[PDB]
Design a protein around this ligand. Sequence first.
Ligand SMILES: COC[C@H]1COCCN1c1c(NC(=O)Nc2ccc(OC)c(Cl)c2)cnc2cc(C)nn12
Ligand SMILES: [Mg+2]
Length: 351
Amino acid sequence: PLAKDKVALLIGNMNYREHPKLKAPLVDVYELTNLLRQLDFKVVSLLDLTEYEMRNAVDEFLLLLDKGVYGLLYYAGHGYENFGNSFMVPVDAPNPYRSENCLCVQNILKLMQEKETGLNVFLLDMCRKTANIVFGYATCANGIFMKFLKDRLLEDKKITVLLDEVAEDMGKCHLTKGKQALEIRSSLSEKRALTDPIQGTEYSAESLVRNLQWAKAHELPESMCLKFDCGVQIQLGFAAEFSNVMIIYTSIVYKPPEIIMCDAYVTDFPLDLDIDPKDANKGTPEETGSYLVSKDLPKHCLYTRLSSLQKLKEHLVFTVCLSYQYSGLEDTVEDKQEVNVGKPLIAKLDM
Ligand SMILES: COC[C@H]1COCCN1c1c(NC(=O)Nc2ccc(OC)c(Cl)c2)cnc2cc(C)nn12
Ligand SMILES: [Mg+2]
């Protein structure tokens, strides 16, 4: 059994404006991304999406579901049931909910039902109120579903057999023991698995430009070295937590011996990103809201988390500031430099 290609769209909503926050989507989408990438899936991981951003992400994902393709869609966040229908709640939903402002699962399923895909796995991990589709619906540090799913996902068995084993894991767990926490709906008529290889990777112009636009939509700005007149050199580094989340970190690489102190800090970011200056320039990545890529970031820097890159409609332009003092000097001099790192990650798509 072969896949024409393997694409995945992972969405996690946690920072709700009018509803309770959720912690699990953060680690769950992060761990699911690495595992799916290990299975040779091109992944798009998005955190905290409004209604229009979800509708654009899901439509574009469905466009990739050509004949023979293996697709996986995963959602983690608020959801609600309204007369037999299930809805995914965007971070911009009002309180109380209105179905119109949410994404109907049954509408998406109907759209997937028209594809001639090899495998279509749709996972819903919600906090509640042939197309070879395998729908998984969960209604419950990782969340319960991902804790059991992450331990089985790399198994070389049929996805239905694999998800059925997870249902049995969850049924033994003292938390969801004897509870209706997982439903699996399936129309899989053949032996497909998330581990199946991709057919002979060939030079077809249409699939190569979508693979290279996916590569382009995940390009980070390269390392930067800014030199100030005083002789101080600052390095700007960039890391990615999600397709729409980039960390920026600064360090002083060189400081002249005659300079007693030098503090580098970034400010004046485009207002679409809504970066609070009290959350930027922290001594640890955890202080910025970054708890996953923290172990892979270089130490003893100043960190700023840029979430909401899907909202950036212009070039990422910001100021790098430097406060410094010389030997014997009673006054602290201030100097600045403007930086333009293009449109990083998902911002390349022109939102
Ligand atoms: C058409 O495919 C384009 C490809 C290539 O570039 C990366 C994005 N792509 C996508 C998306 N797309 C989106 O998420 N689009 C998006 C648009 C507007 C938005 O905000 C207004 C947001 Cl938040 C998202 C979704 N699933 C997948 C899965 C794969 C393998 N790629 N892929
Ligand atoms: Mg809808």
